[PDB]
Amino acid sequence: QFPKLREWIGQRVIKDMAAQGYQITNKLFESTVGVKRTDIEDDNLGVYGPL
Amino acid sequence: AIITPALISALKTSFQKHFQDALATAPSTYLQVATVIPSTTASNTYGWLG
Incomplete structure (x- = not known):
């Protein structure tokens, strides 16, 4: 923001602004499950279908 | 040669x-001593009436 306006005291003063920043790094995520193939092959019921 | x-x-x-x-x-x-039976299955159940 610009500095607030003030009454001139006799000699004007140079002021400065304040700028900042913010950084965020990506993160890597994982989720996995292992199942024996014979169970899927022997899945006539269909229990593992909604996996 | x-x-x-x-x-x-x-x-x-x-x-x-x-x-x-x-x-x-x-x-x-x-x-000669065994018969082949397809399974298509995890296990097989054999039950006969008397």
Whole structure:
């Protein structure tokens, strides 16, 4: 923001602004499950279908 | 004439296959004592009425 306006005291003063920043790094995520193939092959019921 | 060992050792000769399948024992001797039943299944259940 610009500095607030003030009454001139006799000699004007140079002021400065304040700028900042913010950084965020990506993160890597994982989720996995292992199942024996014979169970899927022997899945006539269909229990593992909604996996 | 006057051929070096490499040329003589080199495969001027043909390669046959009569060696293979000579000791191929005939399988399926178990059919005389066993019957083949398809499963298509994790397990099989056999139950007969008396």
